[PDB]
Amino acid sequence: MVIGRVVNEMEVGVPADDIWAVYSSPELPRLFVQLMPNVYKKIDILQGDGTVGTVLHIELADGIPEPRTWKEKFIKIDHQHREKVVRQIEGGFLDMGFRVFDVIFKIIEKDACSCIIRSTTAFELDEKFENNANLITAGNLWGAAKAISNYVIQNKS
Amino acid sequence: MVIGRVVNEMEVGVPADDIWAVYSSPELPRLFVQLMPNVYKKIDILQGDGTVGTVLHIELADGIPEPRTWKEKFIKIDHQHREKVVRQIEGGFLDMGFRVFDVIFKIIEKDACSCIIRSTTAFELDEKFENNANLITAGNLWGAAKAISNYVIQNK
Numbered sequence: 001m002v003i004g005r006v007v008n009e010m011e012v013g014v015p016a017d018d019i020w021a022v023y024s025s026p027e028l029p030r031l032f033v034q035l036m037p038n039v040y041k042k043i044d045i046l047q048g049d050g051t052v053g054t055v056l057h058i059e060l061a062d063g064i065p066e067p068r069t070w071k072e073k074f075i076k077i078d079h080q081h082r083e084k085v086v087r088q089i090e091g092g093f094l095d096m097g098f099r100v101f102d103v104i105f106k107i108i109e110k111d112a113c114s115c116i117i118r119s120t121t122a123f124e125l126d127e128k129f130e131n132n133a134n135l136i137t138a139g140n141l142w143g144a145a146k147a148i149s150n151y152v153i154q155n156k157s
Numbered sequence: 158m159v160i161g162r163v164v165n166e167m168e169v170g171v172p173a174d175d176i177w178a179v180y181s182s183p184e185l186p187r188l189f190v191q192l193m194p195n196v197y198k199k200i201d202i203l204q205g206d207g208t209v210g211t212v213l214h215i216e217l218a219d220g221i222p223e224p225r226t227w228k229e230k231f232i233k234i235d236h237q238h239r240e241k242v243v244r245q246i247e248g249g250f251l252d253m254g255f256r257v258f259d260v261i262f263k264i265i266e267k268d269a270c271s272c273i274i275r276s277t278t279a280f281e282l283d284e285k286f287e288n289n290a291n292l293i294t295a296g297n298l299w300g301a302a303k304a305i306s307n308y309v310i311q312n313k
């Protein structure tokens with residue numbers, strides 16, 4: 001099997017708690033559609049109150065390369081460590097040879113007034129489909145870090 | 158800056174020493190061209206004997222996306238930890254907003270007869286070129302892992 005991860009890190013000049021408050025917020029499914037229309041077309045909440053166990057249905061914008069639709073589940077929201085794990089559970093990359101497809105957001109304290117958004121995409125991929133690993137790029141989830149940090153910064157202004 | 162890395166891991170049923178012996182070998186530049194001509198068209202040794210400080214000039218095969226040419230340098234060959242670090246020093250991704258562009262091969266012993274090839278591509282990228290992060294994909298260097306593992310396995 002192909003075991004793989006991509007990671008990017010964004011430094012943000014606000015405290016970690018202020019960024020984690022939004023990444024962990026159950027309102028995030030709405031903010032993705034609201035703030036990133038070129039990425040997220042429609043997100044439905046299928047089950048749950050926004051805490052662990054919540055299931056979403058994702059539809060990406062027209063013309064974005066496949067996969068554009070899937071169901072995902074919030075499987076970890078660790079407030080201690082400011083780490084959120086979201087796992088695809090139906091469709092999406094699971095129909096393209098991936099046996100596991102996780103996205104992990106970790107908000108790292110840099111100092112009292114700045115933090116790092118670490119966005120990890122981690123997967124296990126059938127070797128018969130190894131070329132699909134090239135669909136996963138080091139820029140994955142950077143746009144979301146940019147949109148969420150911008151939302152927090154400008155609202156403080 | 159964009160701080161970023163991609164990593165893939167291949168399990169291989171031979172001892173770590175046998176895989177590290179080839180990844181760390183100064184013959185590796187020749188094996189890349191010999192075994193993967195669809196990727197590496199030409200690799201010249203510009204300076205050095207294969208140890209730390211050795212500089213190579215890479216030309217990728219036609220049809221591979223830009224950037225196709227660069228110079229790189231072996232900046233670490235850690236035999237104790239089985240880790241090799243190769244840094245681009247001219248051209249390559251340095252012409253596309255990347256300020257640091259490293260490739261790291263680490264051979265991880267699992268048990269006496271099996272290991273993991275961990276191939277990491279790690280970079281720092283200017284945010285004016287932040288979209289160029291999408292040029293770096295999770296499959297990077299997987300083909301080299303296939304070629305070297307096969308070379309070691311079949312030769313045993």
